[PDB]
Amino acid sequence: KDMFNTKSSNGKLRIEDASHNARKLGLAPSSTDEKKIRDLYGDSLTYEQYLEYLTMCVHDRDNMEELIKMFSHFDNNSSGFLTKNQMKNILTTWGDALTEQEANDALNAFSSEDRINYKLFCEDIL
């Protein structure tokens, strides 16, 4: 039990404080799931609604983990980064393939001339 917690607080729960709690639980609620929880229950949540928001945040962490794990399969350069070249190869070869230009535009809009942090890339995409 929290040794330093007061006495007050209720009549709902601010979603900023709910995002704070999820983040301490080892999650990372984005603006998207923070938006759809507003566009459903409002600026403050009941305990049941807080649980659903946490569940939502569990799914998004699992999704991000899968993406980071995916890009790491092509990490020949020990660990951390991938080149724009490797990146466009993935994005133009598989799925709803982006065109050569679409792959360039997106990677050029992201950052460095030849080196991309794929962990931050996935964070942003989700």
Binding site: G95, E102, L126
Partner: peptide, 13 residues
């Protein structure tokens, strides 16, 4: 999946 990544990239026009 990669399908998700591509769809989000496209949503950024």
């Amino acid at each position: 999946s990669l399908m998700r990544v591509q769809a989000h990239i496209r949503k950024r026009m």
